[PDB]
UniProtKB/Swiss-Prot annotation, chain B:
This is Glutamate receptor ionotropic, NMDA 2A. It comes from the Eukaryota. The chain holds residues 503 to 552 of 1464 of the full protein. Glycans are attached at N39. Changing R2W: In FESD; decreased protein abundance; decreased localization to the cell membrane; no significant effect on calcium ion transmembrane import into cytosol.
UniProtKB/Swiss-Prot annotation, chain C:
The gene is GRIN1. It is found in: Cell membrane; Postsynaptic cell membrane; Postsynaptic density membrane; Synaptic cell membrane. NMDA is probably regulated by C-terminal phosphorylation of an isoform of GRIN1 by PKC. Its phosphorylated state is influenced by the formation of the NMDAR-PPP2CB complex and the NMDAR channel activity. The chain holds residues 500 to 549 of 938 of the full protein. A hydrophobic region that gives rise to the prediction of a transmembrane span does not cross the membrane, but is part of a discontinuously helical region that dips into the membrane and is probably part of the pore and of the selectivity filter. The lineage of its organism: Eukaryota, Metazoa, Chordata, Craniata, Vertebrata. It is linked to Neurodevelopmental disorder with or without hyperkinetic movements and seizures, autosomal dominant: An autosomal dominant neurodevelopmental disorder characterized by severe intellectual disability and developmental delay, absent speech, muscular hypotonia, dyskinesia, and hyperkinetic movements. Cortical blindness, cerebral atrophy, and seizures are present in some patients. This is Glutamate receptor ionotropic, NMDA 1. It comes from Homo sapiens. Belongs to the glutamate-gated ion channel (TC 1.A.10.1) family. NR1/GRIN1 subfamily. Component of N-methyl-D-aspartate (NMDA) receptors (NMDARs) that function as heterotetrameric, ligand-gated cation channels with high calcium permeability and voltage-dependent block by Mg(2+). NMDARs participate in synaptic plasticity for learning and memory formation by contributing to the long-term potentiation (LTP). Channel activation requires binding of the neurotransmitter L-glutamate to the GluN2 subunit, glycine or D-serine binding to the GluN1 subunit, plus membrane depolarization to eliminate channel inhibition by Mg(2+). Glycine binds at P17, T19, R24. Heterotetramer; the NMDAR subunits are modular and harbor tiered domains that function in concert to regulate opening and closing of the cation-selective ion channel pore. Forms heterotetrameric channels composed of two GluN1/zeta subunits (GRIN1), and two identical GluN2/epsilon subunits (GRIN2A, GRIN2B, GRIN2C or GRIN2D) or GluN3 subunits (GRIN3A or GRIN3B) (in vitro). Can also form heterotetrameric channels that contain at least two GluN1 subunits and at least two different GluN2 subunits (or a combination of one GluN2 and one GluN3 subunits) (in vitro).
Length: 50, 43, 50
């Protein structure tokens, strides 16, 4: 019940001195734009609806 | 270096990801398709 | 918890649903979100019988 409130998003947390920030962000964006995210959502979220 | 900070409707893409750095987006939008609409107790 | 374990060096990267917050970002930098969802209210569904 309810429409939406305090809408936010998820993410990946790394330490401030970790040099794996841009190399992970670029990979995440590549996966998002290459259709992997929608396939994962369909295979893990989209199922039978009551 | 003509403009250090740019604010506007800048689409986020992979090519701009490494060339320039941007913060967390505030509004979500992406690729969508707009198409003109075309004109007994069964269930 | 997990945030303290990450700050203590027991962790290097977190791959899990973690809502982005100002307090968390003040100490742990985050990456670009892969999916955004808000918080709603869950209530058990009952079927009336009159
Ligand atoms: C406000 C909005 S609008 C918004 N849209 C999205 C949609 O998914 C992406 C995925 C990759 C990307 F490069 C950009 C957006 C996520 C998200 O978290 N948000 C947010 C919260 C604040 C930002 C935290 O990351
Ligand atoms: C990130 O990837 C580039 C090549 O795409 C590589 O040269 C660089 O070493 C990587 N970053 C780290 C921290 O290894």
């Amino acid at each position: 019940t309810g429409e939406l409130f305090f809408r936010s998003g998820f993410g990946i947390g790394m330490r401030k001195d970790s040099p794996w920030k841009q190399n992970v962000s670029l990979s995440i964006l590549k996966s998002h734009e290459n259709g992997f995210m929608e396939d994962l959502d369909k295979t893990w979220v989209r199922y039978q609806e009551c | 270096q003509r403009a250090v900070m740019a604010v506007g409707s800048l689409t986020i893409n992979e090519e701009r990801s490494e060339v320039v750095d941007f913060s967390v987006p505030f509004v979500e939008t992406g690729i969508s398709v707009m198409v003109s609409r075309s004109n007994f107790l069964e269930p | 918890g997990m945030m303290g374990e990450l700050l203590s060096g027991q962790a290097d990267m977190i791959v899990a649903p973690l809502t982005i917050n100002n307090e968390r970002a003040q100490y742990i930098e985050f990456s670009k979100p892969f999916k955004y969802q808000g918080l709603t209210i869950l209530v058990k569904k009952e079927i009336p019988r009159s």
